Tab-separated table of C-alpha atoms and ligand atoms in Angstrom:
chain	number	residue	atom	x	y	z
A	1	UNK	CA	-0.141	-0.014	0.253
A	2	UNK	CA	0.977	3.607	-0.286
A	3	UNK	CA	3.837	5.121	2.307
A	4	UNK	CA	3.385	8.046	3.738
A	5	UNK	CA	5.197	10.061	1.359
A	6	UNK	CA	3.472	8.440	-1.680
A	7	UNK	CA	-0.051	9.341	-0.146
A	8	UNK	CA	1.590	12.980	0.338
A	9	UNK	CA	2.606	13.337	-2.983
A	10	UNK	CA	-0.301	11.882	-4.698
A	11	UNK	CA	-2.570	14.123	-2.448
A	12	UNK	CA	-0.575	17.057	-3.646
A	13	UNK	CA	-0.903	16.827	-6.974
A	14	UNK	CA	-4.502	15.848	-6.948
A	15	UNK	CA	-5.449	18.780	-4.739
A	16	UNK	CA	-5.595	21.332	-7.551
A	17	UNK	CA	-8.289	19.130	-9.281
A	18	UNK	CA	-10.205	18.055	-5.974
A	19	UNK	CA	-10.010	21.471	-4.813
A	20	UNK	CA	-13.243	23.762	-6.331
A	21	UNK	CA	-16.829	22.320	-6.788
A	22	UNK	CA	-16.522	22.919	-10.050
A	23	UNK	CA	-13.025	20.784	-10.062
A	24	UNK	CA	-14.765	17.894	-8.338
A	25	UNK	CA	-17.001	17.444	-11.283
A	26	UNK	CA	-14.621	18.073	-13.733
A	27	UNK	CA	-12.610	15.424	-12.695
A	28	UNK	CA	-15.377	13.146	-11.934
A	29	UNK	CA	-16.433	13.759	-15.600
A	30	UNK	CA	-13.246	12.963	-16.923
A	31	UNK	CA	-13.146	9.526	-15.449
A	32	UNK	CA	-16.736	8.262	-16.710
A	33	UNK	CA	-16.043	10.056	-20.144
A	34	UNK	CA	-13.008	7.436	-20.802
A	35	UNK	CA	-14.985	4.649	-19.290
A	36	UNK	CA	-17.979	4.942	-21.289
A	37	UNK	CA	-15.854	5.677	-24.470
A	38	UNK	CA	-14.391	2.310	-24.069
A	39	UNK	CA	-17.359	0.670	-22.968
A	40	UNK	CA	-20.724	2.641	-24.201
A	41	UNK	CA	-22.701	-0.527	-23.089
A	42	UNK	CA	-21.653	0.631	-19.419
A	43	UNK	CA	-24.019	3.909	-19.669
A	44	UNK	CA	-27.036	1.773	-19.269
A	45	UNK	CA	-26.222	0.431	-16.130
A	46	UNK	CA	-26.232	3.647	-14.334
A	47	UNK	CA	-29.880	4.466	-13.910
A	48	UNK	CA	-29.621	8.223	-13.933
A	49	UNK	CA	-28.277	7.335	-17.748
A	50	UNK	CA	-30.517	5.318	-19.378
A	51	UNK	CA	-31.430	5.870	-22.649
A	52	UNK	CA	-28.153	8.188	-23.174
A	53	UNK	CA	-25.555	6.874	-25.907
A	54	UNK	CA	-21.993	8.014	-25.757
A	55	UNK	CA	-22.995	11.226	-28.433
A	56	UNK	CA	-24.841	12.552	-25.354
A	57	UNK	CA	-24.471	10.958	-22.215
A	58	UNK	CA	-21.859	14.073	-21.049
A	59	UNK	CA	-24.581	16.362	-21.291
A	60	UNK	CA	-27.184	14.347	-18.878
A	61	UNK	CA	-27.870	15.576	-15.502
A	62	UNK	CA	-26.735	12.488	-13.748
A	63	UNK	CA	-23.782	12.068	-15.000
A	64	UNK	CA	-22.786	15.549	-12.676
A	65	UNK	CA	-24.321	13.417	-9.938
A	66	UNK	CA	-21.962	10.449	-10.367
A	67	UNK	CA	-18.651	12.403	-11.381
A	68	UNK	CA	-18.879	14.299	-7.829
A	69	UNK	CA	-19.817	10.988	-5.798
A	70	UNK	CA	-16.489	9.119	-7.865
A	71	UNK	CA	-14.038	12.096	-7.089
A	72	UNK	CA	-15.520	12.304	-3.264
A	73	UNK	CA	-14.763	8.652	-2.674
A	74	UNK	CA	-11.272	8.565	-4.417
A	75	UNK	CA	-10.256	11.226	-2.384
A	76	UNK	CA	-11.855	9.544	0.838
A	77	UNK	CA	-9.940	6.652	0.325
A	78	UNK	CA	-6.590	8.481	-0.566
A	79	UNK	CA	-6.834	10.317	2.316
A	80	UNK	CA	-7.317	7.674	4.840
A	81	UNK	CA	-4.486	5.135	3.029
A	82	UNK	CA	-2.239	5.207	5.694
A	83	UNK	CA	-5.098	3.848	8.144
A	84	UNK	CA	-5.195	-0.042	7.298
A	85	UNK	CA	-8.370	-0.015	9.038
A	86	UNK	CA	-10.121	2.850	7.654
A	87	UNK	CA	-9.091	2.560	4.226
A	88	UNK	CA	-10.399	-1.144	4.328
A	89	UNK	CA	-13.790	0.067	5.748
A	90	UNK	CA	-14.394	2.862	3.652
A	91	UNK	CA	-13.232	0.696	0.377
A	92	UNK	CA	-15.832	-2.152	1.491
A	93	UNK	CA	-18.652	0.136	1.692
A	94	UNK	CA	-18.116	2.120	-1.328
A	95	UNK	CA	-18.300	-1.423	-3.145
A	96	UNK	CA	-21.438	-2.446	-1.476
A	97	UNK	CA	-23.038	1.367	-2.358
A	98	UNK	CA	-22.692	-0.372	-5.885
A	99	UNK	CA	-26.268	-2.062	-5.265
A	100	UNK	CA	-27.533	-2.041	-8.792
A	101	UNK	CA	-28.149	-5.555	-9.878
A	102	UNK	CA	-26.996	-3.860	-13.180
A	103	UNK	CA	-23.049	-4.229	-12.268
A	104	UNK	CA	-20.720	-6.932	-11.536
A	105	UNK	CA	-17.535	-7.686	-9.977
A	106	UNK	CA	-16.042	-8.271	-13.401
A	107	UNK	CA	-17.332	-5.031	-15.037
A	108	UNK	CA	-16.435	-3.031	-11.916
A	109	UNK	CA	-12.587	-4.375	-12.425
A	110	UNK	CA	-12.698	-3.752	-15.806
A	111	UNK	CA	-12.653	0.015	-15.094
A	112	UNK	CA	-9.138	-0.043	-13.356
A	113	UNK	CA	-7.028	0.132	-16.465
A	114	UNK	CA	-8.989	2.974	-17.554
A	115	UNK	CA	-9.331	5.129	-14.286
A	116	UNK	CA	-5.479	4.487	-13.881
A	117	UNK	CA	-4.378	5.836	-17.285
A	118	UNK	CA	-7.052	8.917	-17.198
A	119	UNK	CA	-5.838	9.750	-13.201
A	120	UNK	CA	-2.296	9.209	-14.492
A	121	UNK	CA	-2.527	11.755	-17.495
A	122	UNK	CA	-4.244	14.009	-14.830
A	123	UNK	CA	-1.432	14.440	-12.642
A	124	UNK	CA	1.861	16.646	-13.444
A	125	UNK	CA	4.574	13.952	-12.965
A	126	UNK	CA	6.111	10.738	-12.767
A	127	UNK	CA	6.341	10.253	-9.252
A	128	UNK	CA	2.784	10.867	-9.212
A	129	UNK	CA	2.002	8.638	-11.975
A	130	UNK	CA	3.339	5.981	-10.330
A	131	UNK	CA	1.791	6.606	-7.138
A	132	UNK	CA	-1.572	6.983	-8.838
A	133	UNK	CA	-1.560	3.217	-10.089
A	134	UNK	CA	-0.095	1.899	-7.227
A	135	UNK	CA	-3.139	3.521	-5.181
A	136	UNK	CA	-5.598	2.491	-7.813
A	137	UNK	CA	-4.525	-1.373	-8.064
A	138	UNK	CA	-4.645	-1.246	-4.063
A	139	UNK	CA	-8.304	0.091	-3.799
A	140	UNK	CA	-9.995	-1.434	-7.050
A	141	UNK	CA	-10.019	-4.779	-5.572
A	142	UNK	CA	-10.904	-3.796	-2.458
A	143	UNK	CA	-14.342	-2.337	-3.640
A	144	UNK	CA	-14.874	-5.405	-6.013
A	145	UNK	CA	-14.622	-7.794	-2.396
A	146	UNK	CA	-17.970	-6.650	-1.986
A	147	UNK	CA	-19.865	-6.351	-5.536
B	201	HEM	C1	-12.269	3.972	-8.201
B	201	HEM	C2	-13.321	3.593	-8.300
B	201	HEM	C3	-14.640	3.840	-8.531
B	201	HEM	C4	-15.132	4.174	-7.285
B	201	HEM	C5	-14.779	5.310	-6.194
B	201	HEM	C6	-16.730	4.427	-7.226
B	201	HEM	C7	-17.370	5.381	-6.703
B	201	HEM	C8	-19.124	5.290	-6.553
B	201	HEM	C9	-19.829	5.747	-6.093
B	201	HEM	C10	-19.155	6.329	-4.169
B	201	HEM	C11	-20.907	5.305	-6.111
B	201	HEM	C12	-22.491	5.942	-5.387
B	201	HEM	C13	-23.118	7.182	-5.717
B	201	HEM	C14	-24.444	7.561	-4.794
B	201	HEM	O1	-25.576	7.175	-5.896
B	201	HEM	O2	-24.095	8.439	-4.083
B	201	HEM	C15	-21.051	5.316	-7.778
B	201	HEM	C16	-21.863	4.146	-8.258
B	201	HEM	C17	-22.203	3.723	-9.380
B	201	HEM	N1	-20.835	2.851	-9.751
B	201	HEM	FE1	-19.028	3.831	-9.447
B	201	HEM	N2	-17.239	3.748	-8.388
B	201	HEM	C18	-15.623	3.405	-8.925
B	201	HEM	C19	-16.103	2.744	-10.682
B	201	HEM	C20	-17.109	2.398	-11.069
B	201	HEM	C21	-17.091	1.501	-12.021
B	201	HEM	C22	-15.626	1.111	-12.832
B	201	HEM	C23	-17.767	1.088	-12.939
B	201	HEM	C24	-18.901	0.671	-13.748
B	201	HEM	C25	-18.608	-0.541	-13.594
B	201	HEM	C26	-18.677	1.782	-11.943
B	201	HEM	C27	-20.179	1.623	-11.615
B	201	HEM	C28	-21.235	2.076	-10.831
B	201	HEM	C29	-22.837	2.453	-11.067
B	201	HEM	C30	-23.541	1.624	-12.242
B	201	HEM	C31	-23.498	3.236	-9.708
B	201	HEM	C32	-24.770	3.468	-9.361
B	201	HEM	C33	-25.622	4.351	-9.981
B	201	HEM	C34	-26.764	4.588	-9.528
B	201	HEM	O3	-27.222	3.614	-8.152
B	201	HEM	O4	-27.345	5.523	-9.627
B	201	HEM	N3	-18.021	2.510	-10.614
B	201	HEM	N4	-19.648	4.645	-7.542
């Protein structure tokens, strides 16, 4: 798992992407955009997005809700990453929050490489890009266990 320094560095580099209400939504939007471009069939699995296509999903109201809650969840896990017990608990709950019968463990897990590339591209440098991957590779399976 992340060392204290890796957590600090990642928080620093993600900070300017997760500060303002707008940036928090913006960050989440990009992640889902990447996800739906690779897997447009996942769109209909998000209840608020039903009927949208990849052509128009980014303009829905629903995607802003999802964008906000995604960014918030990622940041929350990052902030607790040095608390083994807490991050495990938070991660498990976020997995459980994926109640929809439309989403499976395997579908969830397929988002890992996509979110990894996205967040790596979003952060500034090599040290942050490596920390992103270590961070996501660690937390994806934690959440998926409860899906
Ligand atoms: C970094 C990894 C992820 C995190 C932290 C995350 C977080 C969340 C959170 C917090 C919610 C609840 C939002 C609410 O109603 O309050 C949610 C919903 C959802 N997520 Fe994720 N998610 C992640 C990855 C994915 C992936 C890759 C998929 C695609 C398989 C996915 C599919 C869904 C679906 C279908 C919902 C339910 C939308 C609803 O019921 O309205 N998530 N996600």
